[PDB]
Amino acid sequence: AEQAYRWELNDDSARFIKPGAWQGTYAGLLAGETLMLSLAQMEDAHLK
C-alpha cells in the first residue's frame, strides 16, 4: 500500500511504514495497533 501511494502521487521519498512495530522483547503485542496507525497516517496524507 506504500508503493501504491508512491506511484499515484509521484513521491518516491514518502515513507510511512517504519521498522519498529515488532518488539521481540514484549513479543510484539502492539504490532497490529502500530501498523493500523501507520495505515491511518498514510490515507489521511493521501486525502490531503
Binding site: 508512491r6 506511484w7 499515484e8 509521484n10 518516491d12
Partner: protein
C-alpha cells in the same frame, strides 16, 4: 529513438519495430506550465488505419523501455484489431488495478511497437498487411496534476 528498424535480440529478427521518443512529441507545450508540473500517462490506445484481409487480425506489441517503477506486466500492450485498440478485453477504469502505461511521465522514455512475422524474404504472415499500412495512431490519455 525515432527510428524504424528490426529486433536486435534473439528470435525477433523478423519483427518490424517502430519506435518513438516521448521528448520529441512535445506534449508539455500543449498547455501552460501554470496548470501543473506533474503530467503522467493514464492510458494509451492504438489505431492502425490499414487495409485488412477478410477474416484477419493484427499482431502488434506496444512496449516501453524502462521497467523501473512500473508494475508487473504493465509495460507492454497487445494490439489485436487496431481500431481504437487497447490491450484490454474490457477497458475498465474502475477495476482497481493500474492500466498499462499508467503513470509513465510525459517527457521521458521511448515507446516502441513491434510487428512480429513482418519480413517478406522469411515469408512472414504479416508481410502482406504492412504494405497497406498508412499510419500508426497513438491515442495517449494523460492527467495533469
Amino acid at each position: 529513438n525515432n527510428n524504424l528498424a528490426f529486433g536486435a535480440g534473439t528470435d525477433t529478427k523478423t519483427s518490424l519495430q517502430a519506435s518513438v521518443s516521448f521528448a520529441d512529441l512535445k506534449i508539455r507545450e500543449d498547455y501552460p506550465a501554470s496548470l501543473g508540473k506533474i503530467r503522467r500517462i493514464k492510458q494509451i490506445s492504438v489505431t492502425l488505419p490499414a487495409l485488412l484481409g477478410p477474416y484477419q487480425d493484427v499482431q502488434a506489441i506496444l512496449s516501453y523501455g524502462d521497467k523501473a517503477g512500473l508494475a508487473n506486466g504493465c509495460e507492454a500492450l497487445a494490439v489485436s484489431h487496431g481500431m481504437n485498440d487497447s490491450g484490454q478485453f474490457q477497458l475498465d477504469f474502475n477495476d482497481g488495478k493500474f492500466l498499462p502505461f499508467e503513470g509513465i511521465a510525459i517527457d521521458q522514455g521511448t515507446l516502441t511497437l513491434s510487428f512480429p512475422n513482418a519480413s517478406m524474404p522469411e515469408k512472414g504472415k504479416q508481410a502482406t498487411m504492412l504494405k497497406t499500412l498508412n499510419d500508426i495512431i497513438l491515442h495517449i490519455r494523460y492527467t495533469i496534476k
